[PDB]
């Protein structure tokens, strides 16, 4: 069926003071909803093109599909990766997986922090699992859909688009990237990891 | 372990006359091998950065990782999607899946053909499965890693980079895009689809 | 010599209420300054590479050069295109140039408004002059350096990166794109145009 | 008026054996002509949108305009930068300009060679003049329109898209990048430079 805006598992102001409730409400209710609507529209426009047998706008359609679907995919994961009862460090299989792939938790954190804070434009930092070579890798994503391979399964993501922190941290993106550690939902990341290696 | 260049399941000239053996040997033995080496190098450079605690080149490293890993992922699938005993049309669950998602096999073929022939630069046409909305979608990929969402599982891909057809078809990319139908390995696409919906 | 942060021709709060003084001070003193420093650094890193005869980081260097130099170029023009004693409509040669290239001033405004409000990520709307075909064209620029040809001379630009309006207009980018008309410095655009056609 | 395919100042096979006549004829008569037609079409589609007051396809239109106009601009310069009576080294003001901006002619050549051979996809190496900081810089351009600032004036360009060398050099792009030095038309580069600093 249609793409739908997911409900949050917590109240908008539940992440304060790391992420303000004013940001969570605009981010959720305005930005995310838009990508949901844009993905729904792109799918519909592609159905119409097929019906009318006219693909003169294929480049635009495939671009709208990709951009909005990725916005949609990315924020859906973001809301799940976040929690009021979060923070701390990972435990168990993930904790071992991460120390083995990055050296240590701290070494993973510094690479993820550098990937998140050096984007030249809108982007995200992403922890994903490569099915091909069976490794945990960090990716720096441009906008929502560029700079990563096909078939990677996302585990943890950090939204580095300006709207994610501007009202609260203004231009100091590093402070925002550091506060994030406090609200990560490791239960969720652990779960995704289990699925990905299954 | 390391990324490795896969072996082909057929002789280089087994796809003639649709794809020449001269192209398959350069494509496999030179282009693909390079991406394999580049992915192996990027992984190694990221290990070194972690060791020396220096991420001043993070943007370059994450870009090399993404580009080569995607080149690697993309060609690995390409070789499997191809066969001497191929062509014809899909059968069974896939055949029904495709008619249901695109209208008909022919309607799917025209959209894939338009996506493949309208790239403005290097790119590919890709048939993938969206886990989020549980739909089969076509994506137009730029280079190897741009213009699609995270977590999509690739089913069929058509290499539209110039090196894929230049020696044989020269600038007539449409003739190459049409000959491709003759060598598609539907057994492989079917298999990927089963896995993806499992 | 070195790239330098230009001085404004007006006080930070001189554009209120269309653009808040709080935005002008962060935008100028923090964002722009950064691009100035990044361009200065890239030029220096390229000199070092030449000296040590090592271009293993050429892709990174050319990317840093391009991104920061463009950020620098773009904001430098932005500050000049803005004025407290601005707004209204163009007059003279430009006014005729624009009606001739776009139909009418209003038709130019609607295209520029659509280009500015539909970017999928960070970007700008840009009015430039094509030396090759001697025409005035509108370009939609991605980030600071993508999606336009070489040798185009920029006349008017509208900053659509989130930091340009977020604190004041939040997600309502269209209201920001509409307020801009009130502070455009047509004297400046006219001047650039004369130079470009000279 | 309309964009038009320029005539060459030499016969297609005049650059042998560095660049084959078979490549020059496909490159000129097929690839370039296409960009000319695409630019002419984009300009026309934008006029229609203005007339019908409908900019629902603005993103596509501005992308087609940019891509084809840049293809057009880039190849037009390429044909001029090439000559049968070329090669050797620059002389006079340019020769001094280049040694001053890069160290030496050889140091300029190695950077340009690295920029040309490391593109990850279609691209070009470009020698341009920055009006803002009054410096000669090298840019690595992605496709035809990305990765450089507005207002730069192009002086020398090297086409690194596969179609530029594939038939002759196959995957050995470095040999092609080295043969180019033999056919550069320094008279042309000198001329552009004079204009740019005027
Ligand atoms: Fe966001
Ligand atoms: Fe290929
Ligand atoms: Fe800005
Ligand atoms: Fe070319």
Where are chain C's structural domains? 20-83, 84-198
Q: Chain B: give the shortest CA distance to residue A184, in Å.
A: 20
CB D73 within 8 A of CB C151: yes
Cα-to-centroid distance, D127 and ligand 4 (Å) = 17
- Of the bound ligands, which one is closest to the alpha carbon of residue C160? 3
Cα-to-centroid distance, D68 and ligand 2 (Å) = 24
Cα-to-centroid distance, D23 and ligand 2 (Å) = 21
- D166 and B162 within 8 Å at the Cβ level: the answer is yes
User: How many Cα neighbours within 13 Å face the side chain of D112?
Assistant: 25
The helix or strand, by DSSP H or E, that contains position D28, with its residue range, turns out to be: none
Strands B153-159 and B123-130: antiparallel
| Residues around the ion ligand 4 (C-beta < 5 A) | D 159, 161, 164
Q: Which residues of D touch A60 (CB under 8 A)?
A: 57, 59-60
End-to-end CA distance of chain D: 26
What letter would DSSP give residue B184?
Answer: B
Q: Which long-range CB contacts under 8 A does C178-181 form with residues at least 24 apart? A: C178/C113, C179/C18, C179/C19, C180/C18, C180/C19, C181/C87, C181/C109
Of the candidates C71, C89, C140, C82, which has an alpha carbon nearest to the alpha carbon of residue C111? Answer: C140
CB A108 within 8 A of CB A98: yes
Q: Chain A: give the shortest CA distance to residue B129, in Å.
A: 10
Give the Cα separation of A57 and A37 in Å (integer).
Answer: 19
Alpha helices in D13-104 (DSSP H): 21-26, 33-51, 58-81, 92-102
Q: What is the C-alpha R_g of chain D?
A: 18
Q: Which residues of B touch A142 (CB under 8 A)?
A: 146
Query: For this experimental structure, what is the resolution in angstroms?
Result: 2.9
Q: How many CB pairs under 8 A join C and D?
A: 157
Give the Cα separation of C58 and B187 in Å (integer).
Answer: 43
Q: Are B20-83 and B84-198 the same fold in CATH? A: no
- Of the bound ligands, which one is closest to the alpha carbon of residue A171? 3
What letter would DSSP give residue D91?
Answer: -
Of the candidates C153, C165, C157, C155, which has an alpha carbon nearest to the alpha carbon of residue C140? Answer: C157
Of the candidates C38, C84, C70, C114, which has an alpha carbon nearest to the alpha carbon of residue C182? Answer: C84
Q: For A67, which residue in chain C has the nearest alpha carbon?
A: C120
Alpha helices in chain A (DSSP H): 21-26, 33-51, 58-81, 92-102, 105-117, 166-169, 173-179, 186-196
Of A63, A142, A166, the CB nearest to C162: A166
Query: Would you say C113 is a known binding-site residue?
Result: no
Instruction: Please give the full DSSP string across B88-126, using - where no structure is assigned.
Output: S---HHHHHHHHHHHSSHHHHHHHHHHHHHT-SSSEEEE
Give the Cα separation of C44 and C64 in Å (integer).
Answer: 11
- A143 and C121 within 8 Å at the Cβ level: the answer is yes
Of the candidates A73, A117, A83, which has an alpha carbon nearest to the alpha carbon of residue A189? Answer: A83
Cα-to-centroid distance, D111 and ligand 2 (Å) = 27
For chain B positions 70-129, those within 8 Å of chain A (CB to CB) are 70, 72-74, 76, 102-103, 107, 110-111, 114-115, 118, 120, 126, 128
What distances in angstroms separate CA C72 from CA A133, C37, C76, D139, D172, one per listed residue?
A: 41, 9, 6, 16, 37
Q: Chain A: give the shortest CA distance to residue B79, in Å.
A: 15
Of D63, D121, D163, the CB nearest to B143: D121
Cβ neighbours of residue A191 closer than 8 Å, sequence gap 6 or more? none
Method of determination used here: X-ray
Angle (deg, nearest 10), helices D92-102 and D105-117? 70
CB A147 within 8 A of CB A139: yes
Q: CA triplet D103, D108, D113: central angle to 5 degrees?
A: 150
Q: Which residues of A touch D60 (CB under 8 A)?
A: 57, 59-60, 63
* A145 interface with C at CB cutoff 8 Å: no
- C59 and D153 within 8 Å at the Cβ level: the answer is no
CB D67 within 8 A of CB D38: yes
CB B150 within 8 A of CB A148: yes
Give the Cα separation of B180 and B157 in Å (integer).
Answer: 10
The class level of CATH for C84-198 reads: alpha beta
Q: Which fold has domain A20-83?
A: Helix Hairpins (1.10.287)
- C57 and B57 within 8 Å at the Cβ level: the answer is yes
Give the Cα separation of D18 and D140 in Å (integer).
Answer: 23
- D166 and B166 within 8 Å at the Cβ level: the answer is yes
Cis check for the bond before D88: say yes or no (omega within 30 of 0). no
The three-class DSSP label of residue A122 is coil
- Of the bound ligands, which one is closest to the alpha carbon of residue D26? 4
Alpha helices in chain B (DSSP H): 21-26, 33-51, 58-81, 92-102, 105-117, 166-169, 173-179, 186-196
Cβ neighbours of residue B143 closer than 8 Å, sequence gap 6 or more? B67, B70, B121, B122, B123, D120, D121
- Of the bound ligands, which one is closest to the alpha carbon of residue A141? 1
Give the Cα separation of A196 and A101 in Å (integer).
Answer: 15
Cα-to-centroid distance, B75 and ligand 2 (Å) = 6
Disruptive mutation site among D62, D120, D147, D173 for chain B (greatest number of B CBs within 10 Å): D120
Q: What is the dihedral of CA B167, B172, B174, B177, to 10 degrees?
A: 0
Disruptive mutation site among A60, A62, A142 for chain D (greatest number of D CBs within 10 Å): A60
Q: Which residues of C touch D126 (CB under 8 A)?
A: 150
- Of the bound ligands, which one is closest to the alpha carbon of residue B74? 2
Number of CB atoms found within 10 A of residue C92's CB: 11
* B31 interface with D at CB cutoff 8 Å: yes
* A60 interface with D at CB cutoff 8 Å: yes
Q: Which long-range CB contacts under 8 A does B55-62 form with residues at least 24 apart? A: B55/A110, B55/A111, B55/A114, B57/C57, B57/C60, B58/A111, B58/A114, B58/A115, B58/A118, B58/A140, B59/A118, B59/A120, B59/A140, B59/C60, B59/C63, B60/C57, B60/C59, B60/C60, B60/C63, B62/A115, B62/A138, B62/A139, B62/A140, B62/A147
């Amino acid at each position: 069926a249609e793409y739908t805006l997911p409900d949050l598992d917590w109240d908008y102001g539940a992440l304060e003071p790391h992420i303000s409730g004013q940001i969570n409400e605009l981010h959720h209710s305005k930005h995310h909803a838009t990508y949901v609507k844009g993905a729904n529209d792109a799918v519909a426009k592609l159905e119409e093109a097929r019906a009318k047998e006219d693909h003169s706008a294929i480049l635009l359609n495939e671009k709208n599909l990709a951009f909005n679907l990725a916005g949609h995919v990315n924020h859906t994961i973001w809301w799940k990766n976040l929690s009021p009862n979060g923070g701390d460090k990972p435990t168990g299989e993930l904790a071992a997986a991460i120390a083995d792939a990055f050296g240590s938790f701290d070494k993973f954190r510094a690479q993820f922090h550098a990937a998140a804070t050096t984007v030249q434009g809108s982007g995200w930092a992403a922890l994903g699992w490569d099915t091909l070579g069976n490794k945990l890798l960090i990716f720096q994503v441009y906008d929502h859909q560029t700079n990563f391979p096909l078939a990677i399964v996302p585990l943890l993501l950090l939204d580095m688009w300006e709207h994610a922190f501007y009202l609260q941290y203004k231009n100091v993106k590093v402070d925002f990237a550091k506060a994030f550690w406090n609200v990560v939902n490791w239960a969720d990341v652990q779960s995704r990891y289990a699925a990905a290696t299954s």
